[PDB]
Design an enzyme around this catalytic site. Structure first.
Site, PDB file in Angstrom:
ATOM      1  CG  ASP A  54      -3.014  10.233  -4.313  1.00  0.00           C
ATOM      2  OD1 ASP A  54      -2.294   9.486  -4.328  1.00  0.00           O
ATOM      3  OD2 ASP A  54      -3.575  10.893  -5.042  1.00  0.00           O
ATOM      4  CB  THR A  87       2.665   9.399  -5.064  1.00  0.00           C
ATOM      5  OG1 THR A  87       2.000   9.491  -3.646  1.00  0.00           O
ATOM      6  CG2 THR A  87       2.244   8.239  -5.839  1.00  0.00           C
ATOM      7  CB  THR A  88       4.170  11.700  -0.409  1.00  0.00           C
ATOM      8  OG1 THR A  88       2.641  11.952  -0.964  1.00  0.00           O
ATOM      9  CG2 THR A  88       4.605  12.846   0.405  1.00  0.00           C
ATOM     10  CG  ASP A 380      -3.674  -1.995   9.241  1.00  0.00           C
ATOM     11  OD1 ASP A 380      -3.800  -2.319   8.304  1.00  0.00           O
ATOM     12  OD2 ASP A 380      -3.875  -1.257   9.872  1.00  0.00           O
TER      13      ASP A 380
END
Lengths: 513, 513
Positions: A54, A87-88, A380
């Site tokens: 994160d 975010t990244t 997933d």
């Protein structure tokens, strides 16, 4: 005017400093970006250790000094509040986008043009995504098996990818009802080390990690009639304070027999319903267990309140408050209720339900860590099957979108002409970072892969390309069922561009010392 | 092991620091690079002011602290010693080349590959230059006029570009003799403010800034026979010390008459040759001027020794030491020797020489600064005409070479394949900095120009393109006579690559504190 000690940068100096600080941070986090992104280990001055991917966490924990670097930290926090993910991505993409944009500024292209060109190309990018998206039957059996199996492949569980893909598609299809919204809450994941992955299975019912409370209870019940009560089966007392005032010896017996009748009537009524299984939320007195056992009724006590509700949904039993209100219409059906040992531990199986709206996938494996990863693999598979059921659109990955967009935007650029074409051209060139870091993080030749893929894509088509990091060569993405939802890519672009536009809007930076 | 105070960086840290320091310097000097490059003003701590474009000078004068920056300074000095020019070019190109090369390192392409690919593409680049070069007649009248006129255009002197281009081509063609080597020493540039640029002209002879020493000398001589003597026309004295020892009154007269005869015989001999003009290196006694004047002989005294030699070459007179050795075969020819006033000042004109091997271009203009720039304009025109006479090859400019090279190298890259293709691909992409800074320094849209030019070049051909910074649009480079020597571009690449290879060879940087 300003207190001695205050420092100020303006114009091109303010711009140079701000960009450079942002870029260096981007280089620090970019190594985490993508499926092949790695993690960092941060050890504070106290000894505490944090290992994460994160962007916010990394930046929140680190102790920055530079004011310009502190101002960028606010970007990361706003990204989290607004969108959550990206975010990244937003920081890294925003940095390169700003760098490439400044190359235009140096060429004397008004920043209002650069920002407009990006906006325009970004909005057009979403249209192109909707256009190239390959529409499929939401509930197509065959294609669903590819989604499932594609996920499972390359994991420890691949040994039984065929069976697993089958159970996974079926589980979702059952609980989804209509076409369609899915609630993953109706698909339970129970994992117990023991056996192998081959033993994994789907159970059209529920697997509870409890035991039959009393030994004397039947070990097998057929065509069971299950009762779900939430009121305790005890001697009720009035809310108002009360007490018996005995005045004759005849009463010492009168009341004892009265309480016995009340207790027997309670139990007798349950049996009278034809119920052979009973789930009570509160407690069950020992004597009640004894009678329940003698009547061959199976009972469970001290059930969680939240579990009582999950049990109602799954089994299709109606929770009743007063026994007086219970009727046959409130009874639920289970094809089988049986005590099984799994890895020695006793568990209850509610299987062979008519048309269950909640299913369980019992996972087996040679290790705890193995069944944990198998659980992630399914989480997933259910996810992606869900994405396709709600949005009957799929698209090739391996940076195929960005390549399509780069091509079409270049032509559109020529149509618009002027300086604005340079802005749209830079957006198209900026899209290449995705292909660049996909192969970089994979350890593939970024230059050579891109040249081979793009060429092959131009020849074989759209559903006969992409990068296959696993084999390190072009493939058929469609044949291999390597697809992602359009929504992933569309939202990524949207949130990404809105952050870039905020930075592009700034033409003045005033940072205190 | 190391003295406390010493600082060390190694591996990727040593590399990051070194590259970054070099890059920042490159950004500082790159603003001077090119025909549209500007200059800097550096004022030391003492008050002294230096305004230059030279990379070495800028870097030599500035006071650097960082060891890594001090090590790069050595590059600039070695570039000057080895090649002379390309100091700024080599630093700027070397920086970008290193930056693009590191992108390959991050992709895990062994630096031995990157360096090899650059070497290979660089050597192939020279071949391609020789291949695309357009061969012309070294002495072609028409094309020569284009070289000349193309230079003159866009300058104050353009008003008479046709006449000026004519005189310039003729001047070089005359002194070159064979086809060909040119010595620009045979083309004198005399500049005197007054009149306009229209009055400028070529003189098949010489223009000397001297006067006829005596007033009584003829003001006009036709079919002049010029004599060039270097021995002084004085009474010679023996090297050995001597003195006359008079012992009779008859001798007081004997010696006087003896010296008179010697002096008369000297002068008489000059006349006997048929000479009417005489250039003496040393002095001329007043009495000698008087006789020279009476004989209608024109004379000049106190001529520079270096001028005596230039006068021999130009006029075609043979310098004789002893008058005894003078013969008619030693005489030179001038069609006309005349005193003219130019901007009031008296000057001598030696014009109408048969086949002069030295010519003068008298420049006129409304200002000193104007005729100075006109002189520079011609210095270039002679230069470029000289380049074409020695190397009968020309080539389109405006970054046409680099575009041809980028195209062909990309195909060659595909032929080689493997990782090596990425290295050759990066070399081809690196070549684009030239087009990029040509239009950037010109204030043209770098992106849009390149797109328009390359497209137009691909359609109209090789001699129907380039950038025309003056009109800000594609043109016909050949029709406009906008060409440069191949040698410019070939040497630029050679010296540039050898410096880059030195940097690429370094895999260890150890800088003391």
């Amino acid at each position: 005017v300003l207190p001695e000690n205050m420092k100020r940068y303006m114009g091109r100096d303010a711009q140079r400093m701000n960009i450079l600080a942002g870029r260096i941070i981007a280089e620090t986090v970019r190594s985490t970006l993508g499926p092949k992104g790695m993690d960092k280990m941060l050890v504070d001055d106290l000894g505490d250790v944090v290992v994460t991917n994160d962007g916010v966490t990394i930046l929140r924990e680190m102790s920055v000094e530079h004011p310009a670097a502190k101002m960028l930290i606010e970007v990361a926090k706003t990204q989290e509040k607004e969108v959550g993910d990206g975010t990244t991505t937003a920081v890294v993409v925003a940095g390169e986008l700003l760098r490439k944009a400044e190359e235009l500024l140096d060429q004397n292209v008004h920043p209002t043009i650069v920002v407009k060109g990006y906006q325009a190309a970004a909005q057009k990018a979403q249209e192109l995504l909707k256009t190239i998206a390959c529409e499929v039957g939401a509930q197509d059996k065959e294609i669903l098996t590819k989604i499932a199996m594609t996920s499972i492949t390359g994991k420890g569980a691949e040994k039984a990818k065929e069976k697993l893909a089958e159970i996974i598609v079926e589980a979702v299809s059952a609980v989804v009802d209509d076409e369609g919204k899915v609630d993953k809450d109706l698909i339970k994941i129970e994992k117990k080390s023991g056996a192998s992955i081959d033993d994994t299975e789907l159970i059209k019912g529920v697997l509870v990690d409890k035991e039959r409370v009393s030994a004397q209870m039947p070990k097998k019940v057929t065509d069971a009639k299950i009762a779900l009560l939430n009121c305790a089966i005890e001697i009720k007392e009035t809310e108002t304070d009360a007490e018996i005032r005995i005045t004759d010896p005849a009463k010492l017996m009168e009341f004892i027999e009265q309480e016995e009748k009340m207790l027997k009537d309670m139990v007798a009524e349950i049996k009278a319903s034809g119920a052979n299984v009973l789930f009570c939320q509160k407690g069950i007195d020992d004597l009640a267990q004894h009678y329940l056992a003698k009547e061959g009724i199976v009972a469970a006590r001290r059930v969680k309140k939240s579990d009582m509700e999950k049990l109602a949904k799954a089994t299709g039993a109606n929770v009743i408050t007063n026994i007086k209100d219970l009727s046959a219409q409130d009874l639920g059906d289970a094809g089988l209720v049986e005590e099984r040992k799994i890895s020695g531990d006793s568990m209850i199986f509610v299987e062979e339900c008519k048309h269950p709206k909640a299913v369980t996938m019992l996972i087996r494996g040679t290790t705890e860590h193995v069944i944990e990863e198998v659980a992630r693999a399914v989480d997933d598979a259910v996810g992606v099957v869900g994405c396709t059921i709600e949005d009957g659109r799929i698209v090739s990955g391996g940076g195929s979108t960005e390549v399509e967009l780069s091509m079409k935007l270049r032509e559109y650029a020529e149509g618009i002409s002027g300086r604005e074409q340079l802005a749209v051209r830079a957006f198209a060139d900026a899209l290449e970072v995705i292909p660049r870091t996909l192969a970089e993080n994979a350890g593939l030749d970024a230059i050579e892969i891109l040249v081979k893929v793009r060429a092959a894509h131009a020849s074989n088509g759209n559903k006969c390309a992409g990068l296959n990091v696993f084999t390190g060569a072009v493939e058929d993405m469609c044949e291999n069922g390597v697809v992602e939802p359009l929504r992933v890519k569309t939202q990524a672009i949207q949130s990404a561009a809105e952050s870039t536009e905020m930075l592009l809007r700034i033409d003045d930076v005033i940072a205190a010392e």
